Design a protein around this ligand. Structure first.
Ligand code: NA
Length: 129
């Protein structure tokens, strides 16, 4: 599924991501934009052999099981495939664990480099939320 900007804002708010660990909805939509271009089926291989899955490019290194990431953990207790669903529940549940891990949204390197400190409210501008 390719979400619209306001559609994804709405889904994230419904799943309780808005101001989660103090991160406004704009921050989450911005992170999703640059991680996946709002595509739930986005997958990208990392140089270390791990893979990033879904709207928030969650890494098999730590968070999900893909059966092909040696020495990895599955701290969200899910198959990485569940992070590719048109339903964003698994992605949101696991993103709450990641953002709680101690470095907040810096865990998303595209958030740090492309969203952090920017006018993130622009991402929910004109959405009926
Ligand atoms: Na894993």
């Amino acid at each position: 599924k390719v979400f619209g900007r306001c559609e994804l804002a709405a889904a994230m708010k419904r799943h309780g991501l808005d101001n989660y660990r103090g991160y406004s909805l704009g921050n989450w939509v911005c992170a999703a934009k640059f991680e996946s271009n709002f595509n739930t089926q986005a997958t990208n291989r990392n140089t270390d052999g791990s893979t990033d899955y879904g709207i928030l490019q969650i890494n098999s290194r730590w968070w999900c099981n893909d059966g092909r990431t040696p020495g990895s953990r599955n701290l969200c207790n899910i198959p990485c495939s569940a992070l590719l669903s048109s339903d964003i529940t698994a992605s949101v549940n696991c993103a709450k664990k990641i953002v709680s891990d101690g470095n907040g949204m810096n865990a998303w390197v595209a958030w740090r480099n492309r969203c952090k400190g920017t006018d993130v409210q622009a991402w929910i501008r004109g959405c009926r939320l």
